[PDB]
């Protein structure tokens, strides 16, 4: 079943939970009584498309794991890789980084893909 | 040949008209039914796009994979699939194995593959 294993890794470490990215992805999309159902279906669609649009803007379209050229700022989190990937879960991480999520997203757009695509436009030019 | 014109064509010949079908997936009484039809068309289109995303096939109509073909799914040779069979017959033949293949595409690639690319791009 598509539902099987959904959020099973929620309490797992960030590394281990990164091996289940398709399990939590495949379950994201699927009278006033009738209107209420249409709003719920449209909302599921709108949220899916907003997340896919963000992935497109960052140059991560079609990827579950996407590497970027934005350096990590120690002001966002000064934990090392063992503390984040081996000793912490994604819920704890989200709680720690939610204050910096919009800064990071802004950099993902402003500090790379807008510059990377404009440079790729000039490398395929020669 | 227009929409579904290649339905009776062999799988090989039919594979060159994929955009013809792709273009036709998006586009009180009679009002409600129209809105429901529009929402259903969007949801089914996106369900297929979500699967293409998960398999690493986003933005492509022909997508090659890292999942080997298991002879238990079908033991036909290529000349008996692409040259002498239609897609409707193939779909009839691959029915019981569709979920196995989809699960393998989800696990064996774009999950393990992305972790491998994540490590390869590390050096």
């Amino acid at each position: 079943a598509v539902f099987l294993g959904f959020l099973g890794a929620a309490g797992s470490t960030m590394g281990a939970a990164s091996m289940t990215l398709t399990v939590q992805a495949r379950n994201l999309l699927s009278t006033v009584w009738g209107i209420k159902q249409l709003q719920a279906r449209v909302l599921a669609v709108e949220r899916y498309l907003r997340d896919q649009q963000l992935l497109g803007i960052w140059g991560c379209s079609g990827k579950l794991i996407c590497c970027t050229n934005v350096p990590w700022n120690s002001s966002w989190s000064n934990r090392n890789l063992s503390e984040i990937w081996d000793n912490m879960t994604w819920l704890q991480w989200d709680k720690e980084i939610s204050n910096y999520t919009q800064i990071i997203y802004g950099l993902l757009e402003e500090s790379q893909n807008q510059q990377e695509k404009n440079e790729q436009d000039l490398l395929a030019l020669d | 040949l227009g929409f579904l014109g290649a339905a009776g064509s062999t799988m090989g010949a039919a594979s060159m008209t994929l955009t013809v079908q792709a273009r036709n997936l998006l586009s009180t009484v009679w009002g409600i039914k129209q809105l429901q039809a529009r929402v259903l068309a969007v949801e089914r289109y996106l369900r297929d796009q979500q699967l293409l995303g998960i398999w690493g096939c986003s933005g492509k109509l022909i997508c090659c994979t890292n999942v080997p073909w298991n002879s238990s799914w079908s033991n036909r040779n290529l000349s008996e699939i692409w040259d002498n069979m239609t897609w409707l017959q193939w779909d009839k033949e691959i029915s019981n194995y569709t979920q196995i293949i989809y699960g393998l595409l989800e696990e064996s690639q774009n999950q393990q593959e992305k972790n491998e690319q994540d490590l390869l791009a590390l050096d």
């Epitope: 960030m14 890789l81 063992s82 990937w85 | 491998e116 490590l119 390869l120 590390l122 050096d123």
Partner: antibody, heavy 122, light 108 residues
Framework: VQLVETGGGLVQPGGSLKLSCRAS????????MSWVRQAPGKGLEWVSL????????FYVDSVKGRFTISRDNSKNTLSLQMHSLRDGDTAVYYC??????????????????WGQGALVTV | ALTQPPSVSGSPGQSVTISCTGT?????????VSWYQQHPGKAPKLMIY???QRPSGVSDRFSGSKSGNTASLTISGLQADDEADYYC???????????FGGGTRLTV
């Protein structure tokens, strides 16, 4: 930690020889491994590197079309299959732990543990 | 390959340095220049990893540093048991993963 090469002896030019390396004392599947060559009168030369899972393999240009590095994490065994061995390949071949790490781990661009070495004569 | 001076020596109790010279793509660009100590007939032991780090089990008489495109190892308090071939190893990118220098014979 112990790494023991259990390789071959004398092989003719143009032939093939596979080397194996057994690991104990640590979790084999947690570390990247490499093969390093040392000719009888020369210094050390890196030959190949494999990651912890065994999906990514790297070779020195001089052996890219001749050597295959592989690892079986269920047997704690690293191996190098050499084909078309040339006269320039006579050397002691050491297996070692380290040389790479995952993107979620600290960098390990060094060889942390070494075996004693198999002697390959072409 | 990297350049190292052969036949480095000093008296017991004194300090010596072993130089390792590479190019900007070898030593200058990456802070991953390890050092190994190989006793004749034996496998090399890792002595220094990264530019300045020591493995556990290695005494504090060994240290390393880098300046420009030159890396060096310093041994302070030479013992009779330090007679070995010392090697430097630098990470040199994705095309050439590791480059080793020539062996340096240390005599005491």
């Amino acid at each position: 930690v112990q790494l023991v090469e259990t390789g071959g002896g004398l092989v003719q030019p143009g032939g093939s020889l596979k080397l194996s390396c057994r690991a104990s004392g640590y979790t084999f599947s947690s570390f990247a491994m490499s093969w390093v060559r040392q000719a009888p009168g020369k210094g050390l030369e890196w030959v190949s590197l494999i990651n912890d899972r065994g999906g990514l393999t790297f070779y020195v240009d001089s052996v890219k079309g001749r050597f295959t590095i592989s690892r079986d994490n269920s047997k704690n065994t690293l191996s190098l299959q050499m084909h078309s061995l040339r006269d320039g390949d006579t050397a002691v071949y050491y297996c070692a732990t380290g040389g790479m790490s995952s993107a979620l781990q600290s960098s390990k661009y060094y060889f942390d543990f070494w075996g004693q070495g198999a002697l390959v004569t072409v | 390959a990297l350049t190292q001076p052969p036949s480095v020596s000093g008296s017991p109790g004194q300090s010596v340095t072993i130089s390792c010279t590479g190019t900007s793509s070898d030593i200058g660009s990456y802070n991953y220049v390890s050092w190994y100590q190989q006793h004749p007939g034996k496998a090399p032991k890792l002595m220094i990893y990264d530019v300045t780090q020591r493995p556990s089990g290695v005494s504090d008489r060994f240290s390393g540093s880098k300046s420009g495109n030159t890396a060096s190892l310093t041994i302070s308090g030479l013992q009779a048991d330090d007679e070995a071939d010392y090697y430097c190893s630098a990470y040199a990118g994705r095309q050439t993963f590791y480059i080793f220098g020539g062996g340096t014979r240390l005599t005491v």
